[PDB]
Structure formats: C-alpha cells, structure tokens
C-alpha cells in the first residue's frame, strides 16, 4: 500500500541522509555540451559522461557566489537531499563533486525542456493536460513530505519534461528537512503562501498552496496573483480574493478554493486526512494514481526528440568558461559537500 511504500522509501532515504555520498566523480570525466539555463550563483549544462556515453544535466555552482548570496546552508541542503532521494518525478544526483572554484551536481537529463516554455508558448493547458502534471506533483510532495522535506519553489520554470512527457521537479536550492516550523523568507513571489509573506513560522502547507498556484497557472495560462512589482503581488496574495476564468470547471474551482486557502485549518493537504483530501477530490476522479506513478498513462504532450543530447527544447544562453582557480575557495564552508 501507500503507507507501506512510503515506510520502505523512508528507510532508503534515511540511510543515505545519514551517510551522504561524496566526491563520486571529477570534471574531466564529462564533456560539456551546452548551457541549458542559468541562475544567480550558477548554471545547468548538458554534459556527456565519457565512460558510458550517458548524457546528464550538470549543475555548476560558483562557491564564492553562493557565499556572497548567503546560500551556503541551502546549497548543502540541496546536495544532501538530492543524493538521498529516489522518485520517478525527481532527479536524484547520479554524481557530485567539487574543485577549487565550483560545486557540481550531476542528474538525469530531461530533454523535453521546461514546462514554462511550453506553457507560455501554447498559452494554457487543458484541464486533463494540467491534471496529468498536477498528479505527478501531488505524488512527489506526498513522497517528499513523508521524508520531512519541504520543497518551497514550485513553479513551471522548475518542472522539466522528459522524453515520455512526464515531469521532473528540479532545483532543490530551497528544499529543507525540518520536522517543526521554519521561517526563511524564500520562494518565488507569485507562488508564496500568505504565511511566508506575513513572516510567520510555516510548514509543508506552503507546498500545497504552491500547487494551487501551479494548477491555476497551467489551466488559465496566467497565475492567480500577478502585477508588475512583487509588492503588488504580495498585496493580492494576502487579501483573500482570487478570480477564476469562466472556462474553469466547477470541480477545478472547488479544488483551487481549497488549495488557495489562507486558513491553514481548512487548506487541503494540511488537514487530518492529509494528501487524500487532494487525491480523492472530484477533479482527480479520473486519475489512476498508481498508473501515473508507474508511468503507464499516455502523456497528453510528448516532446520533439530528434536524438540523444538534443537541446532544441531549451533556449540558447551565452556559453562561458568553467574556470578552476589554482587556489581552493571556501574550503571550510563546503567541507561536507
């Protein structure tokens, strides 16, 4: 059963969590092919592992930039968590290592590109299309939350599509293993739960709020709360008012009212019944949860796949050197990495 699967999953996770894998490859074991996208203290590249000819996504973080942005502990979280998890809709680390200048995390490559790109281009997804993706997020969060992990950055930008049209939740920069409340102000403005904005201690309920935002955005083509400046967005989020497009089904609107619920005693996912309030909602009535986990459902969108190492579903970014200083930077800060 679910409870049995999750218990065994936790036993597997805890062993790796308590004894993390370290220094399991080196940069010269890979050929760098192309930049798939960038962040403030790093980038993700398509690389080929020369030993096997396997293609991977390689996240390269500049240690000095991580330090400057005060993301040391969050980065240690990311690596420690991703080396320890294993789930169909996440990319665990296949390898990790560091050198004088950088931190490296190597993960399965998803060639379908970002959900963001497809969503913006197509405009919006149909409810069945949005439900297919939402189901995979619901199961991922059930998995993560059972391990006491909060994800804290759900958005289309972080959801990659694989060759079969299924999704991978990527970028665990703000993921954290916490049993109680936590306080860090982090996430993306449009996706922040009101608890975060109002500087309360918060818990995994923020991920279920974020799911409400994602489902809304996928179905409408725009998010429930937007403006030109974040402060205007925060005002809208706290106010306790959302409007649904006329094409939203009755079922969809009701699910969203229960996900985008400022009252934590009423928010779906955070009640006595837990995730099953979501799984057994009418909007998910046609969802076969086991078939989705097993990846037996036919995807409503399958991406263009011209071959191995194809990058056509990603945008182009200016390619820059991976420079490795002759002096070790930030040795003590990232010793456990």
């Amino acid at each position: 059963s679910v409870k049995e699967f999750l218990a065994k999953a936790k036993e597997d996770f805890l062993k790796k969590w308590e004894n993390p894998a370290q220094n399991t490859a080196h940069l010269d074991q890979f050929e760098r092919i192309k930049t798939l996208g960038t962040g403030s203290f790093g980038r993700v590249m398509l690389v080929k592992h020369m030993e096997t000819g396997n293609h991977y996504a390689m996240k390269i973080l500049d240690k000095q930039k991580v330090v400057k942005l005060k993301q040391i502990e969050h980065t240690l979280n990311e690596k420690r968590i991703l080396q320890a998890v294993n789930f169909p809709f996440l990319t665990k680390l296949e390898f990790s290592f560091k050198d004088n200048s950088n931190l490296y995390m190597v993960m399965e490559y998803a060639p379908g590109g970002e959900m963001f790109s497809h969503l913006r281009r197509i405009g919006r997804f149909s409810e069945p299309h949005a439900r297919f993706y939402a189901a995979q997020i619901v199961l991922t969060f059930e998995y993560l939350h059972s391990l006491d992990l909060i994800y804290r950055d759900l958005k289309p930008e972080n959801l990659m599509i694989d060759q079969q049209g299924y999704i991978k939740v990527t970028d665990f920069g703000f993921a954290k293993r916490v049993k109680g409340r936590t306080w860090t102000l982090c996430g993306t403005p449009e996706y922040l739960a009101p608890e975060i904005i109002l500087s309360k201690g918060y818990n995994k309920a923020v991920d279920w709020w974020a799911l409400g935002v994602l489902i809304y955005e996928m179905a409408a083509g725009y998010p429930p709360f937007f403006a030109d400046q974040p402060i205007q967005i925060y005002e809208k989020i706290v106010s306790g008012k959302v409007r649904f497009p006329s094409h939203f089904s009755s079922d969809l609107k009701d699910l969203l009212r229960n996900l985008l619920q400022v009252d934590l005693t009423k928010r779906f996912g955070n009640l006595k019944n837990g995730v099953n309030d979501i799984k057994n909602h009418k909007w998910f009535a046609t969802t076969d949860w086991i078939a989705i986990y097993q990846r037996k459902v036919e995807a409503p969108f399958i991406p263009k796949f011209k071959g191995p190492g194809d990058t056509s579903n990603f945008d182009d970014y200016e390619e820059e050197e991976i420079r490795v200083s002759i002096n070790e930077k930030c040795g003590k800060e990232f010793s456990e990495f």
Binding site: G123, C186, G187, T188, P189, G221, F226, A227, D228
Partner: peptide, 20 residues
Amino acid sequence: TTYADFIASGRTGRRNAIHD
C-alpha cells in the same frame, strides 16, 4: 482581458526566486 493584462506585464518571462 486578464490574458492581455498578463502578456503586457513584465512578469511573463522566467521568474527569479526571492530570499532574505
């Protein structure tokens, strides 16, 4: 339309995370 207001806004591209 709300669609038109969205597309004319400055938040249709990839959105950056915030942090303290």
